């Protein structure tokens, strides 16, 4: 879930 949100901000 952190990795998904990181990609969203990237």
């Amino acid at each position, epitope marked *: *879930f952190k990795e998904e*949100l990181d990609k969203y*901000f*990237k």
Partner: antibody
Framework: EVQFQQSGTVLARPGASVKMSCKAS????????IHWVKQRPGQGLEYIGG????????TYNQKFKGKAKVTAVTPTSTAYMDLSSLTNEDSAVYYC?????????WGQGTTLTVSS | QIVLTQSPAIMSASPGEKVTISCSAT?????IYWYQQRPGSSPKPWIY???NLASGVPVRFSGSGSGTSYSLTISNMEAEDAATYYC?????????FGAGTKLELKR
């Protein structure tokens, strides 16, 4: 405990710039996005932009592109926001906040007044 | 940016009373997130991915919903629950928040 220590209340003149800081502690600074969020008197919250200090990636709400610039300094675990061309609409509380898989920790806020 | 509408804007509730507040989105979103802001202080995470309680949040809180319609429930209101609650979405970029529901304690 994760903690964000934000710089103090600040007055700036219309047309000027202002730099606000957020000193992080309690976690590995390089591994999480850190963001800035705006709250004007009596209104909801508005997302500005953020940065990943591990590699310098930085992204913005398009509304604030060319208005806000977010940077992070990893050796001092400190994030910054610079706001330029200030007007009255920029008077507000500015929060820095981390995301893990949500906005999980927030600074105490910095109040900016723009006035002549 | 996706507009989230919170209802009601203001409400009061007696100690022990069940409370439900709402979040409505103009577009379907897969999850909603809720933040609590006590008067004079910063927001804090309260509920993440619709129904998970954030760190330190008491069990009388719960969340549910789907699609364009979500809610946050307090099974029995306590004085420390008086606060402003914001919903929030990451379905599209940028993240957006609702304008708040202010919950007051009816004494």
């Amino acid at each position: 405990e994760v903690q964000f220590q934000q710089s103090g209340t600040v007055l700036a003149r219309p047309g000027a710039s202002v730099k606000m800081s957020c000193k992080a502690s309690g976690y590995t600074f390089t591994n999480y996005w850190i963001h800035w969020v705006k709250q004007r008197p009596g209104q909801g919250l508005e997302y500005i932009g953020g940065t990943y200090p591990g590699n310098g990636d930085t992204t913005y709400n398009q509304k604030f592109k060319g208005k806000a610039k977010v940077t992070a300094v990893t050796p001092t675990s400190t994030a910054y926001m610079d706001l330029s061309s200030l007007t009255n609409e920029d008077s507000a509380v500015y929060y820095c906040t981390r995301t893990g898989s949500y906005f999980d920790y927030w600074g105490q806020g910095t109040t900016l007044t723009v006035s002549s | 940016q996706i507009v989230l509408t919170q209802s009601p804007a203001i409400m009061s509730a007696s100690p022990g009373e069940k409370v439900t507040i709402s979040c409505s989105a103009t577009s379907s979103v897969s999850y909603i997130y809720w933040y609590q802001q006590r008067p004079g202080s910063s927001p804090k995470p309260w509920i993440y991915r619709t129904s998970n309680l954030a760190s330190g949040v008491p069990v009388r809180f719960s969340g549910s919903g789907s699609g364009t319609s979500y809610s946050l429930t307090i099974s029995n209101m306590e004085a420390e629950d008086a606060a402003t609650y914001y919903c929030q979405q990451y379905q599209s970029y940028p993240p957006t928040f609702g304008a708040g529901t202010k919950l007051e304690l009816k004494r």
